[PDB]
Design a protein around this motif. Structure first.
Motif, PDB file in Angstrom:
ATOM      1  N   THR A  18       0.607  -1.153  -0.080  1.00 39.87           N
ATOM      2  CA  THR A  18      -0.175  -0.136  -0.137  1.00 39.87           C
ATOM      3  C   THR A  18       0.754   1.233  -0.091  1.00 39.87           C
ATOM      4  OG1 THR A  18      -0.285   0.167   2.536  1.00 39.87           O
ATOM      5  CG2 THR A  18      -1.929  -1.072   1.021  1.00 39.87           C
ATOM      6  N   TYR A  19       2.082   1.239   0.431  1.00 33.81           N
ATOM      7  CA  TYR A  19       3.078   2.570   0.375  1.00 33.81           C
ATOM      8  C   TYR A  19       3.042   3.090  -1.041  1.00 33.81           C
ATOM      9  CZ  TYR A  19       6.424   5.841   0.796  1.00 33.81           C
ATOM     10  OH  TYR A  19       6.958   7.248   0.924  1.00 33.81           O
ATOM     11  N   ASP A  45      -0.911  -4.863   3.170  1.00 32.12           N
ATOM     12  CA  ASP A  45       0.336  -4.643   3.941  1.00 32.12           C
ATOM     13  C   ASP A  45       0.427  -3.203   4.142  1.00 32.12           C
ATOM     14  OD1 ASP A  45       3.224  -5.865   5.149  1.00 32.12           O
ATOM     15  OD2 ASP A  45       3.486  -4.094   3.887  1.00 32.12           O
ATOM     16  N   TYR A  50       3.437   4.610   6.806  1.00 36.00           N
ATOM     17  CA  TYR A  50       2.932   4.889   5.432  1.00 36.00           C
ATOM     18  C   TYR A  50       1.817   6.146   5.313  1.00 36.00           C
ATOM     19  CZ  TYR A  50       4.973   0.225   4.718  1.00 36.00           C
ATOM     20  OH  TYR A  50       5.983  -0.696   4.665  1.00 36.00           O
ATOM     21  N   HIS A 112       8.438  -2.922  12.627  1.00 38.12           N
ATOM     22  CA  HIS A 112       8.650  -2.525  11.404  1.00 38.12           C
ATOM     23  C   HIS A 112      10.337  -2.787  11.029  1.00 38.12           C
ATOM     24  CE1 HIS A 112       7.251   0.673   7.978  1.00 38.12           C
ATOM     25  NE2 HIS A 112       8.175  -0.077   7.576  1.00 38.12           N
ATOM     26  N   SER A 161      10.467  -7.500  11.009  1.00 37.66           N
ATOM     27  CA  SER A 161      10.405  -6.925   9.699  1.00 37.66           C
ATOM     28  C   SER A 161      12.009  -6.275   9.827  1.00 37.66           C
ATOM     29  CB  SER A 161       9.580  -5.976   9.124  1.00 37.66           C
ATOM     30  OG  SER A 161       9.899  -5.461   8.095  1.00 37.66           O
ATOM     31  N   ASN A 162      12.630  -6.461   8.818  1.00 42.39           N
ATOM     32  CA  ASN A 162      14.152  -5.878   8.571  1.00 42.39           C
ATOM     33  C   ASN A 162      15.172  -6.736   9.676  1.00 42.39           C
ATOM     34  OD1 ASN A 162      13.790  -4.270   6.189  1.00 42.39           O
ATOM     35  ND2 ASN A 162      12.450  -3.192   7.613  1.00 42.39           N
ATOM     36  N   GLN A 185       9.306  -9.923   7.536  1.00 41.24           N
ATOM     37  CA  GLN A 185       9.254  -9.321   6.439  1.00 41.24           C
ATOM     38  C   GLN A 185      10.540  -8.503   6.031  1.00 41.24           C
ATOM     39  OE1 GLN A 185       6.625  -5.465   4.740  1.00 41.24           O
ATOM     40  NE2 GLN A 185       5.524  -7.315   5.709  1.00 41.24           N
ATOM     41  N   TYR A 211       9.498  -8.136   0.572  1.00 46.48           N
ATOM     42  CA  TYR A 211       9.052  -6.847   0.174  1.00 46.48           C
ATOM     43  C   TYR A 211      10.219  -6.243  -1.056  1.00 46.48           C
ATOM     44  CZ  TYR A 211      12.233  -4.029   3.171  1.00 46.48           C
ATOM     45  OH  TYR A 211      13.719  -3.730   3.695  1.00 46.48           O
ATOM     46  N   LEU A 231      13.081  -5.420 -13.159  1.00 49.85           N
ATOM     47  CA  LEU A 231      12.018  -6.012 -14.168  1.00 49.85           C
ATOM     48  C   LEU A 231      12.674  -5.831 -15.571  1.00 49.85           C
ATOM     49  CD1 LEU A 231       8.704  -4.549 -13.086  1.00 49.85           C
ATOM     50  CD2 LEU A 231       9.629  -6.651 -12.475  1.00 49.85           C
ATOM     51  N   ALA A 264       3.344  -7.513  -3.563  1.00 51.76           N
ATOM     52  CA  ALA A 264       3.363  -6.682  -4.828  1.00 51.76           C
ATOM     53  C   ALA A 264       2.461  -5.465  -4.395  1.00 51.76           C
ATOM     54  CB  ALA A 264       2.823  -7.458  -5.693  1.00 51.76           C
ATOM     55  N   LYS A 265       3.252  -4.216  -4.654  1.00 47.09           N
ATOM     56  CA  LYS A 265       2.427  -2.830  -4.663  1.00 47.09           C
ATOM     57  C   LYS A 265       2.377  -2.458  -6.199  1.00 47.09           C
ATOM     58  CE  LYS A 265       2.915   1.625  -5.636  1.00 47.09           C
ATOM     59  NZ  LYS A 265       3.621   2.500  -6.707  1.00 47.09           N
ATOM     60  N   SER A 266       1.145  -1.902  -6.531  1.00 48.96           N
ATOM     61  CA  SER A 266       0.795  -1.281  -7.688  1.00 48.96           C
ATOM     62  C   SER A 266      -0.329  -0.242  -7.288  1.00 48.96           C
ATOM     63  CB  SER A 266       0.479  -2.233  -8.672  1.00 48.96           C
ATOM     64  OG  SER A 266      -0.255  -1.531  -9.814  1.00 48.96           O
ATOM     65  N   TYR A 267      -0.329   0.924  -7.929  1.00 49.36           N
ATOM     66  CA  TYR A 267      -1.518   1.948  -7.954  1.00 49.36           C
ATOM     67  C   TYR A 267      -2.193   1.783  -9.285  1.00 49.36           C
ATOM     68  CZ  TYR A 267      -1.043   3.748  -3.034  1.00 49.36           C
ATOM     69  OH  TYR A 267      -1.044   3.905  -1.651  1.00 49.36           O
ATOM     70  N   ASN A 268      -1.723   0.937 -10.253  1.00 45.82           N
ATOM     71  CA  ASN A 268      -2.290   0.916 -11.562  1.00 45.82           C
ATOM     72  C   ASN A 268      -3.231  -0.230 -11.609  1.00 45.82           C
ATOM     73  OD1 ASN A 268      -1.888  -0.560 -14.431  1.00 45.82           O
ATOM     74  ND2 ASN A 268      -1.606   1.668 -14.700  1.00 45.82           N
ATOM     75  N   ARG A 271      -2.223  -3.519 -13.511  1.00 51.14           N
ATOM     76  CA  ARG A 271      -1.102  -4.255 -13.048  1.00 51.14           C
ATOM     77  C   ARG A 271      -1.448  -5.006 -11.766  1.00 51.14           C
ATOM     78  NH1 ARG A 271       1.766   0.038 -15.501  1.00 51.14           N
ATOM     79  NH2 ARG A 271       1.989   1.273 -13.772  1.00 51.14           N
TER      80      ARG A 271
HETATM   81  N1  LIG Z   1       8.989  -3.737   6.124  1.00 47.32           N
HETATM   82  C1  LIG Z   1       9.424  -2.866   5.163  1.00 47.32           C
HETATM   83  O1  LIG Z   1      10.320  -2.140   5.815  1.00 47.32           O
HETATM   84  C2  LIG Z   1       8.910  -2.653   3.884  1.00 47.32           C
HETATM   85  C3  LIG Z   1       9.699  -2.013   2.972  1.00 47.32           C
HETATM   86  C4  LIG Z   1       9.195  -1.490   1.704  1.00 47.32           C
HETATM   87  C5  LIG Z   1       7.978  -2.125   1.198  1.00 47.32           C
HETATM   88  N2  LIG Z   1       7.388  -2.482   2.328  1.00 47.32           N
HETATM   89  C6  LIG Z   1       6.088  -3.140   1.658  1.00 47.32           C
HETATM   90  O2  LIG Z   1       6.085  -3.862   0.426  1.00 47.32           O
HETATM   91  C7  LIG Z   1       5.339  -3.461  -0.493  1.00 47.32           C
HETATM   92  C8  LIG Z   1       5.978  -3.906  -1.814  1.00 47.32           C
HETATM   93  O3  LIG Z   1       7.147  -3.262  -1.834  1.00 47.32           O
HETATM   94  P1  LIG Z   1       7.627  -1.905  -2.632  1.00 47.32           P
HETATM   95  O4  LIG Z   1       6.571  -0.649  -2.270  1.00 47.32           O
HETATM   96  O5  LIG Z   1       9.007  -1.770  -2.674  1.00 47.32           O
HETATM   97  O6  LIG Z   1       7.225  -1.837  -4.412  1.00 47.32           O
HETATM   98  P2  LIG Z   1       7.319  -3.318  -5.322  1.00 47.32           P
HETATM   99  O7  LIG Z   1       6.292  -4.483  -4.991  1.00 47.32           O
HETATM  100  O8  LIG Z   1       8.814  -4.017  -5.436  1.00 47.32           O
HETATM  101  O9  LIG Z   1       6.707  -2.929  -6.642  1.00 47.32           O
HETATM  102  C9  LIG Z   1       7.521  -1.852  -7.348  1.00 47.32           C
HETATM  103  C10 LIG Z   1       6.945  -1.240  -8.664  1.00 47.32           C
HETATM  104  O10 LIG Z   1       6.496  -2.292  -9.402  1.00 47.32           O
HETATM  105  C11 LIG Z   1       5.496  -1.790 -10.220  1.00 47.32           C
HETATM  106  N3  LIG Z   1       4.733  -2.892 -10.644  1.00 47.32           N
HETATM  107  C12 LIG Z   1       3.630  -3.373  -9.894  1.00 47.32           C
HETATM  108  N4  LIG Z   1       3.248  -4.490 -10.441  1.00 47.32           N
HETATM  109  C13 LIG Z   1       3.648  -4.576 -11.789  1.00 47.32           C
HETATM  110  C14 LIG Z   1       3.532  -5.576 -12.827  1.00 47.32           C
HETATM  111  N5  LIG Z   1       2.676  -6.434 -12.960  1.00 47.32           N
HETATM  112  N6  LIG Z   1       4.294  -4.955 -13.887  1.00 47.32           N
HETATM  113  C15 LIG Z   1       5.305  -4.085 -14.059  1.00 47.32           C
HETATM  114  N7  LIG Z   1       5.274  -3.533 -12.907  1.00 47.32           N
HETATM  115  C16 LIG Z   1       4.642  -3.470 -11.942  1.00 47.32           C
HETATM  116  C17 LIG Z   1       4.761  -0.832  -9.399  1.00 47.32           C
HETATM  117  O11 LIG Z   1       4.359   0.396 -10.246  1.00 47.32           O
HETATM  118  P3  LIG Z   1       2.959   0.973 -10.329  1.00 47.32           P
HETATM  119  O12 LIG Z   1       2.283   1.251  -9.087  1.00 47.32           O
HETATM  120  O13 LIG Z   1       3.089   2.050 -11.217  1.00 47.32           O
HETATM  121  O14 LIG Z   1       1.996  -0.074 -11.031  1.00 47.32           O
HETATM  122  C18 LIG Z   1       5.552  -0.354  -8.159  1.00 47.32           C
HETATM  123  O15 LIG Z   1       5.873   0.940  -7.917  1.00 47.32           O
HETATM  124  C19 LIG Z   1       5.294  -2.083  -0.042  1.00 47.32           C
HETATM  125  O16 LIG Z   1       4.108  -1.013  -0.760  1.00 47.32           O
HETATM  126  C20 LIG Z   1       4.914  -2.156   1.325  1.00 47.32           C
HETATM  127  O17 LIG Z   1       3.607  -2.475   1.675  1.00 47.32           O
HETATM  128  C21 LIG Z   1       7.659  -2.996   3.329  1.00 47.32           C
END
Ligand SMILES: NC(=O)c1ccc[n+]([C@@H]2O[C@H](COP(=O)([O-])OP(=O)(O)OC[C@H]3O[C@@H](n4cnc5c(N)ncnc54)[C@H](OP(=O)(O)O)[C@@H]3O)[C@@H](O)[C@H]2O)c1
Ligand SMILES: COc1ccc(Cl)cc1C(=O)NCCc1ccc(S(=O)(=O)NC(=O)NC2CCCCC2)cc1
Length: 315
Positions: A18-19, A45, A50, A112, A161-162, A185, A211, A231, A264-268, A271
């Motif tokens: 969700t971030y 998540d 956030y 966290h 986490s971490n 995590q 993550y 990617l 997996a984060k996406s705001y699209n 995706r």
């Molecule tokens: N515990 C911790 O310290 C920690 C740290 C970092 C993150 N997290 C959690 O993990 C989540 C995911 O990690 P993250 O924010 O680093 O992002 P991520 O899941 O690695 O995604 C990164 C980018 O991939 C793009 N994406 C998503 N689906 C796709 C697809 N099917 N094809 C191509 N591109 C795609 C997204 O862009 P679009 O939005 O443009 O689709 C996104 O900005 C976070 O939102 C958070 O909840 C936790």
């Protein structure tokens, strides 16, 4: 499509991240969390850090109200931020998370980060010279307060986490430990697969949750712009062609087949819905070994303010 946790609860193996950076309006998180649920994500998540728990909470509330899901169908994770490590601050931190989200309970609550920071109303407390002010806290005591949050039913499961192996062991060897962390995590992707950590985690029945599984959001403020783009990786693009999928789906599926729970984060919208197709195909044992060979100990996250922290996990 769940994993059974060490406290008997179930976690969906695919989770929604969700971030979004502060430049993205807060209405977006509400809107995209609804879409994620509509697509079939059930594990969500978030975290105090956030600044979106109210919106994510509202998306959940909305999807319950319109009859798409019940509360019991959603697995919702929040996280205790490092300014609230002192035991007396843990429960109020949670209750504030719960109040913001309008939930009665989180399904999972995490430490966290092992890197304690000065208590207060800063997320980022800094001194007279703009240096981050660390705090020193015995995390075994933070953990006890986490245990009390579980007993109080405010958090169905608790984990971390971490954390690195040594930090995990501190909790595991704690005298009179009531609850093992269900999970750790951590940053996890083909360029940083955490295989040794994963094997340790498996040996203690602790779930590793990945993550930045798609290579992070590459936020200028924490991520070297010269770092390789996950990617764009040739091996991942080639497996995407072989399987008629995308390199994201290769990265997510990788994690599922090695027994890692993956976010997996996406705001699209497009995706978001693509990402649930992780369940529709299978990598071969050889594809998996091909991806295993991509490890390069590349963590996307950097602050050399945080390298000096005595609890910095990559030591
Ligand atoms: N515990 C911790 O310290 C920690 C740290 C970092 C993150 N997290 C959690 O993990 C989540 C995911 O990690 P993250 O924010 O680093 O992002 P991520 O899941 O690695 O995604 C990164 C980018 O991939 C793009 N994406 C998503 N689906 C796709 C697809 N099917 N094809 C191509 N591109 C795609 C997204 O862009 P679009 O939005 O443009 O689709 C996104 O900005 C976070 O939102 C958070 O909840 C936790
Ligand atoms: C402000 C702000 C918000 C989110 C992020 S973030 O890094 O995108 N989100 C995370 O959850 N974890 C961070 C990175 C790993 C260790 C420390 C916590 C970074 C900074």
């Amino acid at each position: 499509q769940c994993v059974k946790l060490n406290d008997g609860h179930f976690m969906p193996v695919l989770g929604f991240g969700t971030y979004a950076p502060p430049e993205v309006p807060r209405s977006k998180a509400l809107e995209v969390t609804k879409l994620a649920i509509e697509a079939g994500f059930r594990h969500i998540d978030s975290a105090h850090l956030y600044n979106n728990e109210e919106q994510v909470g509202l998306a959940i509330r909305s999807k319950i109200a319109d009859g798409s899901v019940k509360r019991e169908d959603i697995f919702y994770t929040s996280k205790l931020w490092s300014t609230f490590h002192r035991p007396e601050l843990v429960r109020p931190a949670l209750e504030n998370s719960l109040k913001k989200a309008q939930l009665d309970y989180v399904d999972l609550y995490l430490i966290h980060s092992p890197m304690s920071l000065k208590p207060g109303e800063e997320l980022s407390p800094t001194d007279e010279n703009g240096k981050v002010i660390f705090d020193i806290v015995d995390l075994c005591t933070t953990w006890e307060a986490m245990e009390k949050c579980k007993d109080a039913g405010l958090a169905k499961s608790i984990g971390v986490s971490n954390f690195n192996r040594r930090q995990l062991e501190m909790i595991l060897n704690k005298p009179g430990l009531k609850y093992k962390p269900v999970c750790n995590q951590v940053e996890c992707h083909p360029y940083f697969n955490r295989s040794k950590l994963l094997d340790f985690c498996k040996s203690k029945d602790i779930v590793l949750v990945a993550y930045s599984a798609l290579g992070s959001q590459r936020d200028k403020r924490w991520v070297d712009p010269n770092s390789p783009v996950l990617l764009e990786d040739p091996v991942l693009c080639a497996l995407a062609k072989k399987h008629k999928r995308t390199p994201a789906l290769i990265a997510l599926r990788y994690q599922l087949q090695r027994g890692v729970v993956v976010l997996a984060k996406s705001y699209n919208e497009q995706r978001i819905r693509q990402n649930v197709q992780v369940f529709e195909f299978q990598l071969t044992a050889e594809d998996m070994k091909a991806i295993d060979g991509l490890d390069r100990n590349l963590h996307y996250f950097n602050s050399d303010s945080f390298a000096s922290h005595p609890n910095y996990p990559y030591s």
